[model samples]
Target: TFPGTNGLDFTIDGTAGYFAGSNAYWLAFLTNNDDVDKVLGDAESSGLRIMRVWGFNDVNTVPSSGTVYFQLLQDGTATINTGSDGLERLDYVVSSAEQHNVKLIINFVNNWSDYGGIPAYVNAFGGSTTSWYTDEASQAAYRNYIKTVVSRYIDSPAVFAWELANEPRCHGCDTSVIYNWVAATSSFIKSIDSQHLVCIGDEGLGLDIDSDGSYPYSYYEGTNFTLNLGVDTIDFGTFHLYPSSWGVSNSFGSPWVTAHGAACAAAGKPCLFEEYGVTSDKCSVEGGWQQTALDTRGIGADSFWQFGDTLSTGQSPNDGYTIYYGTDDYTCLVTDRVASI
Candidate 1:
């Protein structure tokens, strides 16, 4: 059902996977080996064909030095030549995904805490919040970053999808800013590679997935986070749904999923289930994570949010992120107990 694509359609088994494939995402694959193998390994065995992994997110990465090496300017914009560890992190993880036949949703950049100084947007004149979108230098620098990655790994079969930006809703950015951001960045992807699908990775609700709470899809429909970000430039739509503002769960059948496809249909665009899943602890609510995953898949949304422990935030106060390991981790839908149903 993709635009201009071949006679290909994906299916979702009532219990386990989709797309003759499945998509899942567990954070920080580049951080630790044990956690990576366990989480990603399970995804491979479970028939998940894709996973969304991020790069340079201070909140997601350890040592807190993630953005230091990538920020390019006093304002907003980034440079990709921050040495190969970051690049290697991508290469190694993409390789793993490929080996397991899992597609990789590689996000190129994070919302720099703010676009400022040498430690910020690789070479922009303003911060991410207040940068001049039309400035020649800013636009050129931004495009350079996008083009470099595409040229380097355009041949990577591991790449299932390319995200223009990870949540473009920065502090001072207006609707006009996102329009330009989406247009320029999305155009950059189409101009270079058309092999895989491209889409925006917005954090579904301004309702606050990171604000701190415990509930299910609590923030999915409110205007504070409802999406109106133009449906044309977008190839697929993804929303980071949450049960607890600061926690995680692995269940589905919420009002959000039911409304997802219908909403996209209203817009005249094929809305694939891009991203969903709650964090840990909450992950064991009832029918198991597989039930929610497979159910969502049945509804016709191609996606994954690998591992539900402490998503985007640490699993516990002092233990650090559950992306690597946590007491109640549940995003790794490996068991598939629900797949049978």
Candidate 2:
């Protein structure tokens, strides 16, 4: 793969099957049929085995109003062409990856796409916001939706794992809501689909979720919240690692991997990396400089950051995630994505 490309050849197992998420795709163009095929095709050709589909909050982006949720599907009248909406996006991406001999790790949900919006990421602390965590019935409805789709794909060769939630944390809102979400959604997935491993897409942001009472350390010695959550229904564990975003500064090495490696070692389950960017500063066949430095301390297998534009692809983000916004150029592991830039 290219310096910025992150198509690592790794193996993953599901409820009764195993495959590699051969490629990487962030915000897969659910609406554009051609773009979806291109991205998946490139990854498979690159020898990748898995593709990822993300829903950054799963909220309606039309935003013609102050806030919306499942109701958006009805009132907002956002023509949800399965081929154009998030669902169809996966169908096309999965089909594309399948042609390339790759599988996909589908993220059922993601972080703050409707951030700071009312009735979306609802604020519980005397503020006006409605987080999906707080709304039980709404969440239940979503659960049924995800359960149906995930179960349908569980036996599909194109399916890899079911990520319960992406970074299950909302600012200052009700933590209980998220906690219940993790517990409830995870349990529900297990109930519906007997296949397709599941994990929470946690960023390890010092939240006491999973009752483990610790932040997500790739291999930290103390009790890890994410690892603890790997109790029963969770087939695999995952977390996002960003040294720069988390205040590690230019540690252009895969410190996050080292940490996760340790946790995976302890959990008895191979903890999967949901997100991480690669970096030129530390890309070495022999565990780059930062690798040696962080490995000595223990991190999980490095999914580092991601692959993107050449400028600083796979490096540290100051204190937040990088924003490529709208771009198809530069693949995370595939090539045609370069056309977007």
Candidate 3:
């Protein structure tokens, strides 16, 4: 059966539950089954039940040998690559998650350019970032991509939710830009697959309270957390925290966690403390945030910024935010946190 929501909590086979998980964006890029098994095994053994992965990989041109690119966008058109090096890599991850008893949150696009993201779409079709949301042609292309990816896993129980975009932002634009896009995109996903959940994958920016006029909480980013949470088709709420990156003190995390949780409670939906971390003092600082999430009223689960592990292909990507399995940080941020939940 599919994992779903029970009001303010997640449900596994219709039983309300809370869980701990981590982000592994590279899982769908790996070609080896052993490496995929290793990462998922480590996550399950560490008491994690949900894993977030990148479901969209876009490129302007098809790369040479040994590189992974799931969608090729050029000349105003997008093509899906379902061959061994494309969606098949993600196929194995879904199969492996089922074996490990882990649910997956697969996100469709990235707001940033680490992988070809919004900018890639702008490149394919002549448009600005705002036009990507406002223009009909661009929106049509995006909807097509979303339909293809969601339909591929429509019947897979391993999929926890289909995410709209990773950290989507519309700087200097009105809040309606993102709010409308989320409402339409999430509704479209549900139209095709009613079993799985759908979310915005935003960083929980733009709130009513705690508006210090700072970038993270300001309307300049074009997102309203509470407003989007109330979207009819949005099943749950997701927010990320990066104190150092946001120019806030480490002490800012507790209130951030509390505020988002309170918003979720008001919306009558479960909140995932989706992505959070610090470059240093991870054990103490991140541990405190995890505890705050657990104690918060509407939080049903938490997934750390990233998961790191030593695989046959060598260590997974470490951005200092990664809580590598089998390490002291894992014990504190993951192991202990899982037990608390």
Candidate 4:
């Protein structure tokens, strides 16, 4: 029932929920228990109601071995150890969000190879990127990981949604096969955790051909929006809107916001223009602030790129998408913008 707006009473199980929140990628990186309290506690106090986080970090950072920090791995074995320091950190994140009443949108995997995502699955199952979707072993390992996380806090209200992957797609891969994978995985998540919503974290990229078979948008890629968002078990729709990343005008994010909104509206569900962002050159804070205003009116619910070290005490800062210090100028600008809508 999320994205329930002031305009319509979109109901779910007879209850309405509308989400308007900011992003803090640092939730999973908090180094200590005190850091969790300080970071998420500050989030709730700041009127930030939701945090989007990565549920899996599957990379072997030092080559030959896994990250010293938290990560899941699939190398000659199917495994996830909750006692691992990294995993315990994730546990604290969930509990912390619950304690602070902040919702979470958890992404289970990444489309690219970063953090050992699809590549890990491919290597573990001895399959290609395309086959990773339907390979029985790959599905089994993914399902195990899903069940581990889902079962850990299946009943928590803090988990606003479970995403199948973060912008999931394979380069030189068939969109049809990816769509079917989304459908299957989304359905599987619903079967296990009916209490939570599931979304495919796609970037809403597509190219439409006219009756004469001519492509409309000369600059586009990825599965069609309708085909991906219209999946039966996918409770909501989501797409990132990094105009700079997609080679679009830095000022017109409204197009992506409205297009995905209409897709959700047509599918009888909700949509989130979830990750709109710009670099420091465009005045990252101002560019994102202006886009948030348009998004409130167009898409209904969204959590923009990030809010890192700015809010988390003792946390190392990120160069990209970081808001700088807690009291820094950009921090205040973005904070006020979030509270504005």
Candidate 5:
């Protein structure tokens, strides 16, 4: 069965649980089975219990060959590729997670263009990025894709949750755009699969009660963390921290964690400090944020920006924020961090 929640903490068959995990967004893109096994094995050995991976791979046009894509969107229609090169790759990920006893959080889409995200859908369906929230064709295509993906793993206990999207945002739009979309989409997911938990996968933006007018706390991104947390179907609140990306000092991380934790507590749901990292000084800087998450009352669990390892294929994709296994950074940010958790 999928893990349950006990107020502000996770439950494993009714016992309180706290998880410390890492994200490997590229896991599903690897075509080799050994590479996938190696990454998951390394994560499990490091005492990481949860692995977040990308569940959506959208493409406007089919690639030549050996390119892994789950959905092909063209002519106002979305077709799921279930063959070996398509969701079979994702199949290996879920199967491997079950083998390693690692719970998986699979997000259905991305806000960024890295993996043919919202822009790809907008390009294929004749809508603007902001219109994706309410456009009928876009919403219909999205829900259809969701139903197919959810049904594939509906009975699998390896799934921890079904995330709506990775860092979903709408610039220069009202918070209601993303908020209403989350409410409708999450409820739609629950209608398909009631066993697994559902989350918005947002970056925990727009929650500052004081309204400092900063980008992360501003409503310009079209996300309101507090309001989304109150959506009846959203199982937990998710937030990420990137002080540098948001043009804030590294010290901004501590209060970032504290505010989201308090908001989740007020909403009576657990908060997952979903993604956080610093390109340099990762051990000292990220370690401080991890400690804050551990100390916070309503933070149920945390997963750092990413997990890196020497795969049989090659080194996992590094954006300078990865905590590669066996490195000193891994020792501080992952090993010691998990022990502390």
Candidate 6:
């Protein structure tokens, strides 16, 4: 439990939720009142509490034209386009989440360029990928953006956590640089908003030395659970586990949760299985939910990747990751599994 300064109790109700899409879709949910209601409304009924939504969206083009979009860059500096209704969208999301009794997990950036990630930051700062962590100009721009975003809701309880980055990696830089960056940034986030939690949203991988080769906690993606989560400013821990993507045996699921949970426990921090999904099969699907229940029991909590069928785009023409709306076969699975917990 997080007994705050001077024995002030800091604890949220333990629970789970599905990971929603990026900033664009979250804004879409608020473009209309009914849509936002249905999306969050369904989540409340489904027993989901945590909503992971992206907080950053880099400029779409290298030298942006500044035409309508929620792009957070203009040529080479972090700037929000108020003309695109970006702030309003975020306002509605936080307000609505508070009203719905759902807490938000706000991710600051993406590892890949899905929403203008590292490249965007590098380009805006006029630096190379290797220099991202060291560039003063770019770092200042990012801090400006962080201050603006965090200051807006520092007093609100709607946000439960602030993620340093989504699946953070160094591209090709030294792994230590990445870890160091996380420590510095996490400290900055806590300085601005100490009441909420902060986490390094790497895929939960750390360097190993088994003579040893090893999302996914198996590969060394420039993130160390020990060094990263163990930092005084980290506050908590998180990871993404997908047996299907990694091609590992499903039986290892429980041990995976226990291992990471144990690591965080040793560090004296709470852990969350932030993202987990499997190939759309009865066995894997059922197994995924069971492991999630195990997370609730042993670990602090967890959240599944991708939800809200009304806007989902399927994979491989038929297979998809999102949980469909009412009437689909998978709907019952989501409902029943969540209901059981």
Q: Each candidate: what lDDT?
A: 0.47, 0.45, 0.88, 0.64, 0.89, 0.62
**272-308 per-residue lDDT for model 5 (tens digits):** 9999988899888998888889899899999998999
> Model 2: residues >4 Å from true position, as ranges?
1-27, 55-57, 60-86, 114-131, 170-180, 205-227, 252-255, 278-341
Q: How well is each residue in 83-199 modelled by candidate 1, as lDDT tens digits?
A: 443455556666676566666676666554422321244334443334534556656765676676667567777676688655555343454555566767887788898766677
Highest lDDT model number = 5
What are the models' TM-scores? 0.65, 0.64, 0.97, 0.83, 0.98, 0.81
| Candidate 6 local lDDT, 269-335, one digit each (tens) | 6666777665467435645655554553225656666564463322211235555546354455456
**Residue-wise C-alpha lDDT for candidate 2, range 1-341, written one tens digit per residue:** 10011122224431222222322434353345554565555445543455555532234344433222222333323222232343555566666766766566766544544322224333222222334555554455456557656754665666666776555555564444455666677778878766566667666443232223223432231224443454666655565655554556444224445555455555555555556543333323213422342333223222333422212223212322231222331233223222221
Model 4 per-residue lDDT tens digits across residues 41-124:
776766667778878767543233333234445454666756645677788888888888777888877777866787877777
Model 2 lDDT, full chain set = 0.45
Put the candidates in lDDT order, highest first: 5, 3, 4, 6, 1, 2
Candidate 1, residue 178: the lDDT equals 57
Candidate 6 residue 297 C-alpha distance from true site, Å: 7.0
Candidate 6 matches the true fold with a TM-score of: 0.81
Give the better candidate number (2 or 4) by lDDT: 4
TM-score, cand. 2: 0.64
- Misplaced by over 4 Å in model 1 are 1-39, 56-79, 112-119, 122-124, 128-138, 170-174, 205-233, 246-253, 268-281, 284-334
Pairs in steric clash, model 5 = none
Clashes of each: 38, 44, 0, 0, 0, 1
